[PDB]
Design a protein around this nucleic acid. Structure first.
Lengths: 261, 224
RNA sequence: AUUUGUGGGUGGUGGUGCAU
């Protein structure tokens, strides 16, 4: 049950946004952020069929004027699906420049995009190319210390996965702050990756990848002093038992150059 | 014909592209003219309005907690580190050959130092400098104090022997080497004003304006 | 109650030669 004028205006605005490439956005679209039924207006206007530049502009306007929860809901329900569709059905699995700009804006304002997409991408099972693109975008435009630590703790407390491990590798390349709790979470992730000689799950016997090995090497190069004597010994034991053949030297060098906090 | 009909096929399809582009812009302009207020009436008609967050809230206290920065970089090879420095040594060498072709007041800190002792007041001042640097203008003033105070002390006394004076003196030398590699404009201003004052003193009195401080001035600028 | 003052990363949302 929607008004006929409302439906006509929404369809006309969606068509104008889909066909628009340059110029100014409509005042209807500018006052949509200052309205209530924004999700319904966007669904009627079909933002999936609209322009990526117009979508990036709408996301920036919502991040600059609207509220964080409405911004997170809109960002999830539009951008996550659109980015997944673009990555799956791109001509060469290539991300759009305007979509990347919108994602960079959403990362600059990370109070919404994390709970909107970062847990949602891992839950929806982003592919290897999608995980690599997400890690590259995060390394290009990271976030504040609190948001980075929350994202890292969420990724470590999440189960072992290729996309989660790639996200952990990109976060370790960014080299954010790891407190005692974050270092404990990293050590728990390493112990879960290592085998247990009574009850064991799947990661005890599951093989580890080169991305996970590089993530462990970067974590050892960054947070060597954030691990205590027992934590450094546990990291060295993990890097010996289930570590790589060629990363073992740098791993042991970092685990021996690390100091107890 | 190929440079004409291509120009024809371009601009026709360009204007076709232009007219289509202008049509969407006019539609958006019409959307901001009448459909804008209609959208305001649209929102007045229509109506449409955890665990990870707790883990995020748990990580929020795990972000304002402890922290330690130690993000190390790559490993410098021995020959590689040696070569770049050798390159760095060479870079100033041809440049030399190309050149071979073409805390505030004195007494403000003098009283502070005289109250102290110039056996480690330098190291104390080095801390005071490092403190300010931890917070460059004050550093330039500090170097000015360093210079005129070195001159001042060399004028003052020689009770410290070659193993009590040269210690703090060479400490001042190394300190001013570091502050030379950090600051140069101020040092040039200092030396230039001092040498003009040198001339003025000499002109007022040829022999009655000599100084051991001037001697060590010449020596230090020469090795600097 | 984000922004400024000090430092610093400065290239592959890389093409390509080839093997399988």
């Amino acid at each position: 049950a929607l008004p006929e004028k409302v439906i006509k205006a929404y369809t006309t605005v969606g068509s104008i946004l889909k066909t628009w490439t340059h110029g100014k956005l409509p005042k209807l679209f500018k006052v949509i952020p200052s309205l209530r039924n924004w999700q319904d207006v966007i669904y009627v206007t079909n933002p999936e069929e609209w322009s990526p530049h117009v979508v990036y502009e709408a996301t920036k306007l919502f991040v600059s004027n609207l509220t964080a929860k409405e911004s997170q809901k809109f960002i999830n329900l539009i951008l996550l699906e659109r980015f997944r569709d673009n990555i799956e059905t791109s001509e060469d699995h290539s991300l759009n420049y305007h979509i990347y700009r919108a994602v960079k804006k959403s990362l600059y304002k990370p109070s919404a995009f994390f709970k909107g997409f970062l847990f949602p991408l891992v839950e929806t099972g982003c592919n290897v190319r999608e995980a690599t693109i997400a890690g590259s975008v995060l390394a290009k435009v990271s976030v504040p210390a609190l948001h980075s630590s929350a994202a890292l703790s969420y990724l470590l407390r999440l189960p072992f996965s290729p996309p989660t491990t790639v996200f952990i590798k990109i976060l370790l390349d960014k080299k954010y702050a790891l407190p005692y709790q974050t270092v404990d979470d990293c050590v728990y992730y390493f112990m879960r990756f290592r085998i247990l000689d009574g009850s064991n799950g799947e990661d005890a016997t599951r093989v580890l990848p080169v991305i996970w090995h590089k993530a462990f090497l970067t974590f050892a190069q960054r947070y060597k002093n954030d691990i205590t004597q027992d934590q450094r010994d546990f990291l060295l034991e993990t890097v010996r038992q289930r570590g790589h053949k060629d990363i073992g030297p740098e791993i042991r060098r970092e685990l021996l150059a690390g100091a107890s906090r | 014909k190929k440079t004409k009909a291509e120009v024809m096929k371009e601009v026709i399809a360009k204007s076709k592209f232009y007219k289509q582009e202008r049509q969407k812009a006019q539609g958006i302009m019409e959307d901001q003219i009448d459909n804008l207020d209609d959208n305001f009436e649209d929102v007045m008609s229509e109506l449409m309005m955890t665990d990870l967050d707790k883990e995020y809230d748990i990580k929020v206290k795990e972000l304002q907690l402890d922290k330690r920065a130690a993000p190390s970089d790559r490993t410098k090879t021995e020959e590689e580190k040696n070569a770049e420095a050798e390159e760095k040594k060479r870079e100033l060498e041809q440049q030399r050959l190309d050149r071979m072709n073409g805390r505030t007041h004195d007494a403000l800190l003098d009283q502070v130092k005289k109250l102290d002792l110039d056996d480690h007041p330098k190291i104390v001042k080095n801390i005071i400098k490092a403190y300010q640097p931890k917070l460059k203008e004050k550093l330039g003033k500090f170097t000015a104090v360093l210079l005129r105070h070195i001159i001042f002390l060399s004028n003052q006394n020689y009770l410290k022997n070659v193993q009590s004076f040269k210690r703090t003196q060479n400490a001042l030398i190394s300190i001013l080497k570091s502050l030379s590699e950090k600051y140069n404009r101020e040092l040039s201003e200092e030396c230039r004003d001092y040498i003009n004052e040198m001339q003025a003193r000499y002109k007022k009195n040829h022999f009655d304006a000599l100084s051991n401080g001037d001697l060590v001035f010449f020596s230090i600028i020469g090795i600097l």
